[PDB]
Design an enzyme around this catalytic site. Sequence first.
Site, short mmCIF file in Angstrom:
data_model
loop_
_atom_site.label_atom_id
_atom_site.label_comp_id
_atom_site.label_asym_id
_atom_site.label_seq_id
_atom_site.Cartn_x
_atom_site.Cartn_y
_atom_site.Cartn_z
N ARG A 21 -48.35 93.84 72.81
CA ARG A 21 -48.84 94.14 74.18
C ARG A 21 -49.30 95.61 74.34
NH1 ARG A 21 -43.83 92.43 77.59
NH2 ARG A 21 -42.89 93.52 75.81
N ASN A 39 -46.45 88.45 77.43
CA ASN A 39 -45.77 87.43 76.66
C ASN A 39 -45.63 86.17 77.50
OD1 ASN A 39 -45.28 88.97 74.41
ND2 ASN A 39 -43.30 89.74 75.12
#
Length: 96
Positions: A21, A39
């Site tokens: 990320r 996620n």
Amino acid sequence: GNTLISVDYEIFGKVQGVFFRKHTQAEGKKLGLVGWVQNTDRGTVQGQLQGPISKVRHMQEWLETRGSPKSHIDKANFNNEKVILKLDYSDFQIVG
């Protein structure tokens, strides 16, 4: 003002516990994109990219072969590729 597109993405592979990320946010910003990354509950990474087409397409290639250095990507699914009137986003956030 160029043609702006948005596309949804979901990335399958070794993509969690690898700073995926953070690196997605960094690369999106580097390429002048807005959108988001998170996620998901099924272990994948998901988000949207919005921006000029050549920039979005480059980030799509990134998401297909690269991601974060320690990640390996099995598949990047893209969908809801659409021309947009204006950006829906003003930054690129990690949201989940």
